[PDB]
């Protein structure tokens, strides 16, 4: 019993056997028909089974002589498991190494408490953690070997003035790596841990408070700056926190749902005995099987093992809340209240209340036959395999999100930070755009700010791939050092202009998402992508690649660069556009290669531009873009061939695959000029199959625009930073629209993108790939 209550306890390596779990489960009631299948397979075990292996170590902490108490009136007060993130559940072949340490041992008047924490690891990797709370009830006065230790509610401090950063710098535990830092408009977070040695129930004797101090970035991706180190004696409280309660706030990652929702009110039955468990767990406590102790304990009798109740209820849940998948459960705790006896049935309530880090938060409450409570706790349970997609341009409309911008602080904190930045950089708030789509927007270049901004407008360049020339070409040409204004025109309304659609869409989306994140609805293993525009919103939202501001700067640059590469008419109308196609309508046989044989021909013949730019849904949706004078002609041939239902498939298969060439040449060179006599202001239509895309007049996502990327790519390399990025939130979870395969850092991914784009960075990397070999 000379165990050091402060040292760690080393358990012993334990291998798992399908026999032991098959025994446990039936000792329990965990009929979840997932933990077991055919033997000879890697079957997965229960979270609770961890106790089975931590026990022999979890309690070496409470035996020591310094920690004096009678194991008889001892009580189990609570217990919880936390499957650490990123680690899978556990299996049979999974041998384990456990470890245990007592976090805190306090000396109440009513006795003495202990809170222990165990950590398990397979292959040296931690797998899960376990908290346990006992009670050596009675009376004790050994404060000398008493102590306590905890983590605190991570505090948030939002700094706006400058007299606060001083009272801070006035401090002795508020030390940093560099006082030089700028502490205005910055948001700080304090993930502090406290240790303390007592000498009375209130009058401390030693106090440590350490922990990092982190800062918000424009991405809000916190980062470490300084360290707290508070030391003290004879305290009567903790200051390092008091200066945070009133000053700062509590970043409660939790969030309660609006209206509680019950899941079920179920019932189970204690065993008739408690020996099977006692054999499984190794918990040979006579208190549950023998009677000549419980009576020594002034108890009712051979009570159940409370941990049996924990497992019973957890399995009662898994099936219900997780539809009987266990991997989802990543946290579960329970608080024993009073004790029960075998052959007893219960009204265990279940209730969805909260959300945390994109996973659910349940509470339970086990009522007895007298409908009194014994168990209460909660469970952190994953959500289904989840997926977030983000839209493209074309879904815009008025009032979009502004219904919300009145509601979620988290979204106005975005729209503001964006507009306020535009106004200060380009001179226009969208919050006066979205609400009232105007037809024209004129920009004043007034005093200093006006000049700053007109150069912001002229400081940009339409670099363009000609001759290999990164063609330093002016974005705005009417602009000049002698100008004082500018005008944007859009006959319907500027929200109809890619110039200003893209950014507002990204806003609305990002705002929704960060509201959700405020509500903790976003996992870390979730997926994300977007359709030709939601990619950037997705990057930010999930991975916080970059700020709101650089983000929207570049989305704006992009809308323009899209705009510029085509010449327009009086107000901004040009001769290019795009169309959507449903092979299914022209013919249920109309394949994906039917679109090829029908589009390549118009392209080669009229020499005009038409090309399928989005593979949306096969045989049902494909969109192309390019010359309208050719696009609507391709439309015409389709609307003709459907009323003819000449299945180009039945042409490939009735005709040799080259006479089809002349046949379709004829059809199409006829239909083109039958359709190519349209006036310059070409109008688009849905005939049989294809649908116009108005608001859109540029054929992006086709080779015609290959030239406008180096401008872009360079702008990009400027705005974003290799630091803000974090692969952790890309691998598998990001799926480019270019490469439909999940983002991965591999030669094969690089070549997949390269062989189709043919760019130098891929090839030079795979050539120098061995940098990978550090």
């Amino acid at each position: 019993l000379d165990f050091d209550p402060r040292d760690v306890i080393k358990g012993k390596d334990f291998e798992i056997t399908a026999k032991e779990v098959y025994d446990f489960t039936h000792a329990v009631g965990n009929n979840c028909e997932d933990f077991v299948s055919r033997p000879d397979r890697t079957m997965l075990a229960p979270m609770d089974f961890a106790i089975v292996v931590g026990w022999r170590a979890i309690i070496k902490a409470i035996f020591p002589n310094t920690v004096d108490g009678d194991l008889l009136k001892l009580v189990h007060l609570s217990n919880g498991y936390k499957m650490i993130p990123g680690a899978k559940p556990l299996q049979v072949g999974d041998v384990v190494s456990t470890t245990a340490v007592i976090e805190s041992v306090v000396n109440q008047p009513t006795g003495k408490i202990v809170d222990v924490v165990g950590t398990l690891s397979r292959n040296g990797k931690p797998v899960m953690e376990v908290t346990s709370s006992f009670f050596y009830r009675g009376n004790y006065t050994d404060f000398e070997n008493t102590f306590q230790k905890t983590v605190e509610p991570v505090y948030q401090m939002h700094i706006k003035t400058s007299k606060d950063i001083a009272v801070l710098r006035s401090k002795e535990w508020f030390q940093l790596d560099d006082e030089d830092f700028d502490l205005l408009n910055k948001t700080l977070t304090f993930e502090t841990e406290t240790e303390v040695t007592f000498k009375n129930a209130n009058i401390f004797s030693s106090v440590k408070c350490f922990g990092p101090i982190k800062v918000e970035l424009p991405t809000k991706e916190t980062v470490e700056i300084g360290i707290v180190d508070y030391e003290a004696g004879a305290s009567h409280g903790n200051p390092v926190v008091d200066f945070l309660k009133r000053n700062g706030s509590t970043l409660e990652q939790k969030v309660n749902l609006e209206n509680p929702i019950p899941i079920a009110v179920l019932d189970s039955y204690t065993p008739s005995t408690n020996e099977p468990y006692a054999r499984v767990s190794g918990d040979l406590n006579p208190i549950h099987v023998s009677r000549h102790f419980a009576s020594y304990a002034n108890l009712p009798g051979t009570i159940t093992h409370g941990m049996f109740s924990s497992a019973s209820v957890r399995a009662l849940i898994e099936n219900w809340a997780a539809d009987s998948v266990s991997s989802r459960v990543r946290g579960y705790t329970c608080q024993f209240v009073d004790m029960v006896l075998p052959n007893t049935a219960l009204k265990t309530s279940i209730q969805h209340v909260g959300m945390i880090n994109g996973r659910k938060l349940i509470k339970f409450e086990t009522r007895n036959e007298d409908d009194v409570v014994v168990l209460t706790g909660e469970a952190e349970i994953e959500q289904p395999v989840t997926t977030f997609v983000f839209t493209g341009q074309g879904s815009q409309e008025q009032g979009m999100g502004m219904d919300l911008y009145k509601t979620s602080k988290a979204a106005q904190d975005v729209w503001n930070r964006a507009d306020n930045h535009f106004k200060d950089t380009y001179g226009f708030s969208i919050l006066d755009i979205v609400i009232n789509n105007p037809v024209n927007l004129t920009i004043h270049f007034g005093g200093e700010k006006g000049k700053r901004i007109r150069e912001n407008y002229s400081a940009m360049i339409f670099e363009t791939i000609v001759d290999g020339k990164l063609k330093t070409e002016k974005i705005f040409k009417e602009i000049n050092e002698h100008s004082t204004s500018y005008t944007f025109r859009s006959e319907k309304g500027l929200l109809s202009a890619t110039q200003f659609t893209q950014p507002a869409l990204t806003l609305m989306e990002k705002a929704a998402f960060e509201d959700l994140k405020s509500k903790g609805l976003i996992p870390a293993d979730a997926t994300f992508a977007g359709h030709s525009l939601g990619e950037y919103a997705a990057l930010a939202s999930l991975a916080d690649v970059m700020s709101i501001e650089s983000l929207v700067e570049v989305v704006f640059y992009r809308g323009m660069t899209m705009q510029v590469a085509v010449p327009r008419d009086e107000l901004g109308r040009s001769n290019y556009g795009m169309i959507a196609i449903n092979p299914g309508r022209v013919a249920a046989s109309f394949s994906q290669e039917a679109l090829q044989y029908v589009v390549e021909r118009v392209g080669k013949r009229t020499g005009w531009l038409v090309e399928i730019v989005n593979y949306n849904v096969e045989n049902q949706q494909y969109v192309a873009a390019g010359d309208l004078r050719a696009l609507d002609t391709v439309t015409n041939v389709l609307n003709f061939i459907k009323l003819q239902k000449i299945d180009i498939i039945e042409l490939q298969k009735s005709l040799s695959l080259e006479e089809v060439e002349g046949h379709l040449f004829e059809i199409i060179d006829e239909a083109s000029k039958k359709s190519a006599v349209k006036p310059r202001p070409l109008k688009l239509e849905r005939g049989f199959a294809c649908i116009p895309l108005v608001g859109i007049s540029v054929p992006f996502h086709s080779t015609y625009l290959m030239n406008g990327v180096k401008p872009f790519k360079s702008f990009l390399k400027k705005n974003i930073i290799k630091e803000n990025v974090k692969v952790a939130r890309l691998a598998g979870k990001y799926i480019p629209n270019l490469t439909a395969k999940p983002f991965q850092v591999t030669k094969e991914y690089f070549q997949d993108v390269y062989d189709l784009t043919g760019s130098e960075p891929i090839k030079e990397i795979i050539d120098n790939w061995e940098k990978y070999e550090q």
Binding site: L257, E258, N259, I261, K360, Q383, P384, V385, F388, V389, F390, T391, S395, Q396, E397, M400, G401, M508, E509, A512, L521, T527, H531, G534, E535, Y536, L539, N614, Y615, N616, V617, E618, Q620, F700, H701, M706, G708, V709, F712, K713, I720, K722, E723, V725, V727, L730, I735, P736, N737, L738, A740, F743, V745, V753, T757, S759, P761, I762, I765, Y772
Partner: protein, 94 residues
């Protein structure tokens, strides 16, 4: 690997991906498939003002992944931030 050289390499890959996201067509077929079939999602959320991908969904799912989804007891659920506010906030009343 080395977290930092990899950070840089990823910064690059992302950069050029977004760059040549301008002309290379969108392989939405392949994505709509992979993330729907190789990861067996249960919840796809169309964050946007108008539900279109939803229309693009339950129209590739049903069209190509009906035998498959029934084969394995899938309650595949598609939502839009436009309309499915309670199916996403989990805030419905009876």
């Amino acid at each position: 690997m080395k977290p930092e050289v990899e950070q840089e390499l990823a910064h690059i890959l992302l950069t050029e991906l977004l760059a040549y996201q301008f002309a290379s067509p969108v392989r939405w077929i392949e994505t709509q498939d992979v993330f729907l079939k190789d990861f067996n999602t249960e919840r796809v959320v169309e964050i946007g003002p108008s539900p279109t991908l939803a229309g693009m969904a339950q129209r590739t799912l049903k069209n190509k992944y009906e035998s498959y989804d029934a084969a394995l007891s899938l309650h595949r659920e598609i939502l839009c931030y436009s309309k499915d506010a309670k199916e996403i906030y989990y805030t419905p009343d009876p």
